[PDB]
């Protein structure tokens, strides 16, 4: 059993009682969650997609938290060698590990209306991560995209980040590979071209997806949200602008969850730019997704977004010119620049979902509905098959007792399976 | 109703719910504590010694906490004009106000097997949250204790000591008051400039019951509000790697008796904490009476823990600078932390809060029959009660209405404690 | 005539008399040199290679130096729009302009043994540019390569820089496009992966080549050396390691000029790593260049370099493990980390050369010679055809009065024109 | 032969050729200047007033400049022990030594149509090379002049003034000596700490002829060596946006007469440079004699350029802080620079170096027939000669061997100059 001991980057101190919460036992669940999250960080740049196999490869790996003279040390037992560069752990992965130690301890010490308490946990987690700060102008634009993406979609996703970084704007993704790291490498060379001295590449993951989508090495501010819904909520609240790239089913869910918030009449005065961008060959891909949400949510969905094709400079130029309007709107409310408190996320979009055939059953998918409740629970169906696609329980539940094809309707069921078939075509998992 | 808005320096954001906790309201009692602590901050340099006298003038003073575009923002209503220079607040007081806001919110949010373990962990948490547990390449934090009402000779000597301490790149922690709580910081500020020392840390530690009597001096750059008297005493011993005690009153005696009670515990026999008592030429008679009192009550094995250096500021600073490598190795050889002494054992009786009543003071076990830990703990309480009955409303009210305190003990021990406390009055330290 | 006024990034102050040296006249040569160097900086990322045309496109462009309350302002008349991003000049180009203002004023105020004075001018220029500083360990590796290079050579040149930046090493090129900027973008994302907070991407150009090879935007420390020979000397003295990529004739000259310094017996104890690296398809290209300098300089040339193919991590890993040996050797001499004083550059390699048929005539190219004098003047032949290829006088002199094919010998003349024909094959200019 | 090596803080590399210029050698005369300036740096705080007395003790002291792996490195041989604390040099003196090395090399390297233009450009170049021409959002550099030998009352008042100046985020430039050249810096260091002012700039300006008589105080964080007396005087007026003059001796009078000669030039009628003369209560009789002297020789139109504030440190600092926005707009409306006043016209006669000889002092045009510019320039020379004949070897030698200086002038003007200079002696300022 070969070990390695990692130092803190910023002075970090624990008590003998906080470390004991992480002490290795077979009865305390909390170590396991801390152990696997640490393992996922160490498999950054994973050459695979499956999440069941990565744990089965590093089983003798473990982690001990230590209290030394200068603070906390992470004693890593049998760490993956691909995390090292010449016998030393890549310092981004070191910072990610201590971010995992920071968030896990916080989200569990705080546990020990109801919608106000949830958004505040999101606010308190980002604040404790020191991830809530604005410069002279808000510049945080989050980017959504798939994991297994094209070679041209990657280059296009790098060109957009470079033109975004050239205009001094920061990126926030779900810290995954593919379209979730390509804009960061572009922005890394973009900030270098304009001498932007303080880049913030925020990766926001959560335990149940971190093993399938390992945090890419370009992330410099990683935050662990408790579950899927709070990570989605953190996205739109820390955001000043959104750009969406072609992606698998996980990207579809993100688009609806958000679209279920701008279409709420309680958010008619909120400003939030959204551009769906893609390379030359994503023209057909985008038309089939527009024809989706224009058949699901009506033609109202096109008043809140614009689609641009084969252009990196325009979507960055238009995203930059939106920050003054974003800034101005935060002041009229009296809101904050670094956190959108005023936007109303309905309690039906904050509620969690554990994917089962049983619960995938009674999904309300009729176009009858208020635009909100349809997309609110339609995105649950996408959350269900990402679990069936990537994560241990959804894969297993879909393995043993069958697949999910549960609720039909007019075009939308024509369109639902139009998409996943139009998704498997380009191998989007 | 004159209004002044003061934003802050870092990233400080509050929810609407934490701001609601501090509104002048009948829903939670944080406002009267947060407003009184804020008013004491703005009375820096005030020649006042009582608490009621501070609140008596500024009656129309209030403070709101606003949530705006770039985070928290404090709105002060008729603040003391002495807090201004050329129409702008002194920046030290502005940062102190945001430290009051930080410490009041965190403590009350954290309140909501042993209790001794949890008290020490609370102390550590407040310091951790205040970004106060920082250590360079070597431990260099030197706690200085002294009187709020001192001579100009003692003030100059204390500033000369702090100047020598600053020349050796040592930092200063203090009870943040005036007098000998301010002089070493003024000296270290010049000393650090002479050695071009960049990141000076002048930690002030106060608590709600004393902050109005001894408002934080403007030389403090790191204010910490501990929840009460006992946990601020604990804070001193934990952050310190060396302690210096100038001449002072009962507040200085309380801190002295507290520290001796810890050092004389056999569980701390392997603990390195250099303790130097120092003063100018005239303080020789002072330290002789003080030493004789400690040496009688606690035994002649008390001088094992302190040294008395008189009229030598360079030697005081030289001795503690030489002692820091010893502290570093002591922490190293026990897995302990450089910036927070976990290994030091504080008996629960030293952590137990004490309310000065006429009956509690009369039932202190000041007799030679008791062990030294019981003696030092109860002597701490006795002095703590004299502090309250002198500068705090709950003590002044109870004394001015039921009579002065009457402590009971051995007729020789109290004969010496009396003799000393009258020197305190004679040198214009307390009454 | 539309203008724009640029601010200094670091407080820069001139006197009324230093600016008058730059005052616009038709008789003072010095403004022209300052004007065109400023123009070349503004054409960063040029889509062309020719240097005669770029001046002919921006003739109404001019520059005035101003003395204002907070120091120097650059008043740019009719600047190229491609230098701007949304109506504001890219800040790297701003820093490059003030570096041009800094160096030009210095190299001309200092003018107003002989080999010791030359190296000291090089030292004083780098020192005045604040470009001579070393961290705990020397980490400056310079990279040489062509301008018009492959798409695979660019990606490979980006992979090497990323693995170089992953090991916390800095880059120094001649600030050109192609293989001279690809390692910088790789190192930009490499330093971001290891949280290297202070990258130094040193571009070193000189007046007579800056217009054909515009300073790429990835340069953060640009220095203008007076001529071709001093820029070559600055390279090997500020260097702790060298890596050479496939390139045109300009890259050949750099390889020999250097190789004429390690083969000097006075430099037998000097350590300086050199790796010639290239992608999969540069295997034949490298064998024809080895068979060149092994037929020109003997088999002695292979004791000072090693050739690795289709590997970015090894040449970075071996370049990193060389820094302790580089460091150790600088101490045994009592030399400096940031400037190699001890290395002896023969006066025959410091002497300038103005390319003419007349002076390309009496080149001594017999393999008779001491290894030093052959390569010393053999690299002049390469300096002559780069001038014939890219720069106004060499192009013109070759235009009006014929090409240069002047001195023959055994294999080496077989090998000389073996190369330029083996260079035009892949369009290396 | 005790040896101590001191590396430096920034990136300072020298060629073998610049190091050869400073070797104890018969090839260039930089060594005796560089060694004497270094020895004066290491004698910070020395109670010595003459130059020969500084060099007399440390006779075996020398200094070499080594070129090593990470740049320049200074090797000092038997340096003054007073420069050490706990066996290490004070960091301010170490940085001063590297400023001496920087200024001696640059000046001598720059030496190798009008001459007035080139003198001003040299002054600007030395400041530019020393990274001393920096301006924040507002001009805040306040030049303070005062005596090297002052009262404790005057020292406290000057420190109280500097404390008030530091509370308004104003920086201090000084002739780097002791006394009133040190007190405002000690005060500003505490003042800057109270306002949490981060980047304090305490510029000390000295020159080879005076540095041994008034060694740089340890509170200076930016030492500048100007080549001689006249160019250091020029440096003061150019970097300053305000000037404060405490009581002093002939050196303070020389600086006063120099500045008045510039302000009274009609070419400077549109120049904003606030000038305040200030002192404690007892200095009232001092400033009355001083004001009467200036007001007689230069005319009653001299008070147009200065104000006398007595026993009010807050008002002095308040007046100059209010004056900085005026200075900023003055520079703005003329295209001039914030950190270096190019527009100020210094007559060549004020730039002309003066060697004090018995004949030059006897042929000064101190008569009311001459214009005020000739009067102020020659009065500057007269006082400059008394400085040399008091604390400098070339003056002390010529006086102790040929007799004291005899200045000639109007029998009323010299009657007042005599009367004043005897007050200087009576208050123990010069002899």
Q: CB of C38 within 8 A of CB of C205?
A: no
- Mark the breaks in chain D: residue after which each occurs, C to N over 2.5 Å: 112
Strands B222-225, B202-206: pairing is parallel
Q: CB of B308 within 8 A of CB of B302?
A: no
Q: CB of D35 within 8 A of CB of D54?
A: no
Alpha-carbon distance B235 to B223, whole Å? 13
User: In angstroms, how far is CA A116 from the centroid of its own chain?
Assistant: 22
B342 chain-A contacts, CB cut-off 8 A: 16
- Taking alpha carbons only, the member of B235, B237, B236, B255 closest to residue B245 is B255
* Fold of domain C113-429: Rossmann fold (3.40.50)
CB contact under 8 A, C337 and D70: yes
- Helical pair A371-389 and A283-296, crossing angle rounded to 10 deg: 130
Nearest CA in chain D to C10: D134
D17 chain-C contacts, CB cut-off 8 A: 116, 120
Least CB–CB distance from D335: residue in C13, C67, C123: C67
What are the residues of chain D with a beta carbon less than 8 Å away from any beta carbon of chain C?
A: 11, 13, 15-17, 67-71, 117, 121, 124-125, 128, 133-135, 331-332, 335-340, 342
Q: Where in chain A is the domain with CATH 3.30.1850.10?
A: 1-112
DSSP string, A183-214: HHHHHHHHHHHTT-----EEEEE-HHHHTTSP
List, in order, residues 6 or more apart from A107 with CB less than 8 Å away: A121, A125, A224, A226
- Helical pair A182-193 and A151-166, crossing angle rounded to 10 deg: 30
Nearest CA in chain B to A110: B110
Q: Best residue in A12, A14, A15 to probe B by mutation, most B CBs within 10 Å?
A: A15
User: In angstroms, how far is CA D284 from the centroid of its own chain?
Assistant: 25
* Fold of domain B114-431: Rossmann fold (3.40.50)
H or E stretch covering B52: helix B52-57
Assign C63 to helix, strand or coil. Answer: strand
φ, ψ for residue D407, nearest 5 deg? -90, 140
Could you tell me where the beta strands, DSSP code E, fall in B46-159? 62-68, 71-77, 84-85, 88-89, 141-145
Q: Touch between chain A and chain B (3+ CB pairs, < 8 Å)?
A: yes
List, in order, residues 6 or more apart from A265 with CB less than 8 Å away: none
φ, ψ for residue B169, nearest 5 deg? 60, 45
Structure tokens at D131: 């990274």
DSSP string, D217-276: PTT-SEEEE-SSHHHHHHHHHHH-SEEEE-S--HHHHHHHHHHHHHHTSGGGTT----EE
Nearest CA in chain D to C135: D70
Nearest CA in chain A to C162: A185
Q: CB of B211 within 8 A of CB of B181?
A: no
Residue D1 exposed, middle or buried by CB count within 10 Å (0-12, 13-18, 19+): exposed
Please report, for residues A200, A311, C296, D170, D339, the alpha-carbon distance to residue A158 in angstroms, rounded to integers and kept in the order given: 16, 12, 45, 48, 44
Query: What residue has token string 């900086």?
Result: C41
Q: CB of A202 within 8 A of CB of A171?
A: yes
Nearest CA in chain A to C318: A86
Query: What residue has token string 């400037």?
Result: C339
Resolution of this structure in Å: 2.5
What is the C-alpha R_g of chain B? 21
Q: Which residues make beta-bridge pairs with A7?
A: A73
Distance (Å) from the C-alpha of residue D188 to the closest C-alpha of chain B?
Answer: 9
CB pairs under 8 A between B and D: 60
Alpha-carbon distance B228 to A371, whole Å? 55
The approach used to solve this structure was X-ray
Residue D20 exposed, middle or buried by CB count within 10 Å (0-12, 13-18, 19+): middle
Alpha-carbon distance B21 to B3, whole Å? 21
Name the neighbours of C, counting chains with at least 3 Cβ pairs within 8 A.
A, D
Q: CB of B205 within 8 A of CB of B186?
A: no
H or E stretch covering C277: strand C274-278
Distance (Å) from the C-alpha of residue A269 to the closest C-alpha of chain C?
Answer: 28
**What's domain B1-113's architecture?**
2-Layer Sandwich (3.30)
Least CB–CB distance from D69: residue in C130, C133, C330: C330
Q: CB of D236 within 8 A of CB of D251?
A: no
Alpha-carbon distance B223 to B56, whole Å? 24
φ, ψ for residue C36, nearest 5 deg? -75, -40
Residue A135 exposed, middle or buried by CB count within 10 Å (0-12, 13-18, 19+): middle
Assign A88 to helix, strand or coil. Answer: coil
- Helical pair D250-263 and D372-391, crossing angle rounded to 10 deg: 160
Q: CB of D194 within 8 A of CB of B218?
A: yes
Please report, for residues A303, B184, B307, D81, D428, the alpha-carbon distance to residue B315 in angstroms, rounded to integers and kept in the order given: 77, 15, 12, 17, 33
CB contact under 8 A, C86 and A320: yes
Q: Where in chain D is the domain with CATH 3.40.50.450?
A: 114-431
Each residue of C7-35: b (16+ CB within 10 Å) or e?
A: ebeeeebbbeebbebbeeeeeeeebebbb
List, in order, residues 6 or more apart from A325 with CB less than 8 Å away: A271
Structure tokens at C201: 């991407």
Please report, for residues B221, C82, C99, C225, the alpha-carbon distance to residue C46 in angstroms, rounded to integers and kept in the order given: 53, 9, 20, 21
CB contact under 8 A, C15 and D121: yes
Please count the helices (runs of H) and the strands (runs of E) in chain A.
17, 10
For C348, other C-beta atoms within 10 Å of its C-beta total 13
Alpha-carbon distance A51 to A11, whole Å? 33
Could you tell me where the beta strands, DSSP code E, fall in B157-253? 171-174, 202-206, 222-225, 242-245
Q: CB of A184 within 8 A of CB of A159?
A: no
Alpha-carbon distance D202 to A21, whole Å? 52
Distance (Å) from the C-alpha of residue A69 to the closest C-alpha of chain B?
Answer: 4
Each residue of B117-142: b (16+ CB within 10 Å) or e?
A: eebbbbbbbbbbbbebbebeeebbbb
Alpha-carbon distance A207 to A226, whole Å? 7
Q: Where in chain D is the domain with CATH 3.30.1850.10?
A: 1-113
CB contact under 8 A, D219 and B190: yes
Q: Which residues make beta-bridge pairs with D319?
A: none
CB contact under 8 A, D85 and B200: no
Alpha-carbon distance C149 to C248, whole Å? 8
Structure tokens at A127: 């604040």
Least CB–CB distance from B95: residue in D167, D196, D219: D196
Strands B71-77, B3-6: pairing is antiparallel
CB contact under 8 A, B167 and D194: no
CB contact under 8 A, A132 and B11: yes
Alpha-carbon distance C134 to B360, whole Å? 67
Degrees (nearest 5) of the Cα angle D346, D349, D352? Answer: 100
CB contact under 8 A, C192 and A193: no
D98 chain-B contacts, CB cut-off 8 A: none
Q: Which residues make beta-bridge pairs with D145?
A: D245
CB contact under 8 A, A194 and C166: no
Q: CB of D99 within 8 A of CB of D225?
A: yes
For A10, other C-beta atoms within 10 Å of its C-beta total 9
Structure tokens at C357: 């048929």
Q: CB of A139 within 8 A of CB of A179?
A: no
Name the neighbours of D, counting chains with at least 3 Cβ pairs within 8 A.
B, C
CATH value of C1-112 in 3.30.1850.10, 3.40.50.970, 3.90.1150.10, 3.30.360.10: 3.30.1850.10
- Taking alpha carbons only, the member of D342, D409, D296 closest to residue D116 is D342
Alpha-carbon distance B393 to B56, whole Å? 12
Degrees (nearest 5) of the Cα angle B255, B259, B264? Answer: 150
C132 chain-D contacts, CB cut-off 8 A: 11, 13
Q: CB of B171 within 8 A of CB of B201?
A: yes
Alpha-carbon distance D157 to A53, whole Å? 77
Handedness of CA B231, B237, B238, B243 (dihedral sign): positive
DSSP string, B338-393: SSS--SS---HHHHS-----HHHHHT--BSTTS-HHHHHHHHHHHHHHHHHHHHSH
Nearest CA in chain D to C123: D15
Instruction: Specify the length of chain A in residues.
Output: 429
Nearest CA in chain B to D163: B186
**Could you say which DSSP state residue A215 is in?**
P
A238 chain-B contacts, CB cut-off 8 A: none
CB contact under 8 A, D190 and B195: no
Q: CB of A134 within 8 A of CB of A338?
A: yes
CB contact under 8 A, A195 and C167: no
Q: CB of A243 within 8 A of CB of A278?
A: no
φ, ψ for residue A394, nearest 5 deg? -65, -40
Residue C427 exposed, middle or buried by CB count within 10 Å (0-12, 13-18, 19+): exposed
Strands C306-309, C274-278: pairing is parallel
Q: CB of A221 within 8 A of CB of A215?
A: no
CB contact under 8 A, D86 and B168: yes
């Amino acid at each position: 059993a070969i070990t390695h001991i990692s130092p803190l980057g910023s002075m970090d101190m624990l008590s003998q009682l906080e470390v004991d919460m992480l002490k290795r036992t077979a009865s305390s669940d909390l170590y396991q969650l801390f152990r696997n999250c640490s393992l996922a960080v160490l498999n950054s740049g994973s050459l695979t997609d499956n999440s069941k196999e990565l744990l089965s490869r590093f089983e003798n790996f473990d982690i001990n938290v230590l209290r030394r003279e200068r603070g906390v040390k992470l004693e890593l037992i049998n760490p993956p060698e691909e995390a090292f560069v010449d016998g030393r752990i890549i310092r981004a992965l070191q910072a990610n590990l201590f971010a995992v130690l920071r968030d896990i301890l916080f989200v569990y010490g705080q546990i020990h209306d109801n919608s106000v308490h949830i958004t505040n946990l999101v606010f308190s987690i980002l604040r404790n991560a020191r991830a809530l700060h604005v410069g002279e102008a808000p510049n945080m634009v989050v980017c959504w995209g798939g994991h297994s993406i094209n070679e041209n979609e990657y280059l296009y996703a790098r060109r957009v980040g470079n033109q975004l970084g050239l205009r001094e704007l920061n990126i926030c993704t779900g810290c995954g590979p593919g379209a979730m790291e390509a804009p960061m490498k572009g922005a890394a060379v973009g900030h270098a071209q304009q001498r932007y001295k303080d880049s913030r590449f925020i990766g926001m993951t959560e335990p149940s997806i971190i093993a399938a989508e390992p945090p890419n090495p370009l992330v410099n501010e990683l935050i662990i949200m408790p579950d899927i819904e709070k990570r989605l909520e953190a996205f739109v609240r820390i955001a000043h602008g959104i750009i969406i790239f072609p992606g698998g089913v996980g990207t579809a869910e993100e688009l609806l969850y958000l679209l279920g918030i701008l279409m709420n009449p309680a958010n008619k005065d909120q400003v939030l730019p959204l551009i769906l961008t893609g390379p030359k060959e994503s023209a057909d891909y985008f038309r089939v997704l527009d024809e989706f949400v224009v058949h699901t949510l009506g033609e109202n969905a096109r008043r809140h977004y614009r689609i641009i094709i084969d252009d990196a400079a325009e979507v960055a130029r238009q995203m930059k010119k939106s920050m003054p309007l974003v800034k101005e709107n935060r002041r009229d409310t009296g809101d904050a620049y670094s956190f959108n408190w005023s936007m109303r996320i309905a309690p039906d979009l904050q509620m969690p979902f554990e994917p089962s055939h049983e619960n995938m059953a009674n999904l309300k998918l009729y176009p009858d509905q208020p635009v909100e409740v349809l997309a609110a629970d339609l995105r649950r169906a996408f959350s269900g098959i990402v679990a069936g696609n990537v994560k241990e329980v959804g894969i297993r539940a879909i393995e043993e007792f069958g697949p999910y094809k549960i609720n039909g309707d007019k075009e939308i069921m024509r369109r639902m399976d139009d998409l996943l078939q139009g998704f498997v075509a380009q191998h989007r998992m």
